[PDB]
């Protein structure tokens with residue numbers, strides 16, 4: 170089966186949990202404000218060009234220390250934030266986007282995520298054990314005139330960072346984009362709003378080729394007076410979207426927090442039965458067409 | 467190896483046995499079947515047809531781009547089978 174997603178050169182499982190590449194921490198910057206509910210860091214690692222990753226993949230992280238059994242912790246996966254070329258544009262570099270997992274349970278007890286906290290905690294010069302690259306699910310389309318719809322919530326923006334960098338920041342001989350990049354990103358606060366000035370700079374150098382939309386659940390509501398969730402902002406274009414949904418060169422990508430897609434499906438349900446269509450069957454179909462692609466955690 | 471081929475001509479279906487080292491149209495002909503053709507060297511459109519199922523080794527054609535191969539289009543004059551395969555013939559106008 171030939172796919173509508175660039176499958177050429179893509180490598181997988183080059184390093185595994187038994188023999189991880191040990192890389193090194195170069196940067197590590199908090200990118201949420203101080204008032205931000207969750208805290209999310211943007212981090213870059215040294216790779217030696219030894220991991221020729223491609224836009225949309227994700228990597229594994231073996232956290233330092235051992236479980237109760239003297240055994241390593243289990244591989245956590247993080248969507249690759251930098252483009253192929255890295256943030257420095259030299260391909261010796263991988264970039265991650267990590268939210269620090271901290272909650273209180275019903276006993277008042279502050280619980281912290283092993284890997285998430287290990288990573289935000291990293292200082293320039295620390296070592297990182299690295300698995301991957303992993304995932305074929307979220308690779309770009311072959312079509313460089315593609316309509317690319319990217320739904321993201323929180324640290325589900327990561328791959329789409331990787332996407333846009335290549336699309337708008339970078340000059341490739343084999344690859345020049347010229348379709349429409351539409352991005353929807355939903356978050357709690359204007360303080361959780363990741364990488365915004367970047368997307369700005371893009372929207373600024375490709376006004377018609379890029380369209381962004383954000384959804385701050387806790388700082389906006391619609392005409393109907395309800396919290397602006399990803400779906401709610403989307404619903405504001407339920408027209409073009411549904412329209413664009415019947416094109417052959419429109420590819421949808423969804424990434425982030427398990428649950429967002431109930432929100433979205435619900436909106437699509439009412440749009441489908443408009444044309445007399447059952448959604449999930451149209452869904453399936455787009456998927457078979459690699460036109461719908463989902464990566465949530 | 468020899469595999470089953472089912473041809474859905476515009477004048478109905480007909481099946482037959484094809485060795486994986488013999489081109490498909492070659493067979494059809496000795497088996498008395500009239501399928502459209504021209505070049506018989508896989509860089510034209512006459513023998514056009516569509517893969518419904520099964521696979522073929524049409525390496526050594528040159529007329530179709532990958533999206534037409536992706537679309538299950540096939541040049542009969544230069545397609546060997548690698549499996550039991552069902553095919554519509556007389557599909558040039560549809561490609562055209």
Ligand SMILES: Cc1cc2nc3c(=O)[nH]c(=O)nc-3n(C[C@H](O)[C@H](O)[C@H](O)COP(=O)(O)OP(=O)(O)OC[C@H]3O[C@@H](n4cnc5c(N)ncnc54)[C@H](O)[C@@H]3O)c2cc1C
Pocket residue numbers: 227245246247248266267268269270272281282283284285286324325327464465466
């Ligand atoms: C394909 C993929 C892509 C991913 N991309 C990203 C990304 O870009 N950024 C990112 O930050 N993370 C991402 N993750 C999730 C990531 O792998 C980690 O699971 C996450 O960062 C927390 O890991 P941790 O080790 O810090 O927490 P852990 O030590 O794994 O603790 C989590 C455990 O606590 C429980 N738990 C987890 N969350 C909660 C909660 N909110 N409330 C109550 N209990 C909870 C769970 O049952 C789980 O067993 C991705 C996951 C997948 C599968």
Ligand code: FES
Pocket residue numbers: 502503504505506507508509510511512513514529541542543544
């Ligand atoms: S007839 Fe020209 S390639 Fe088959």
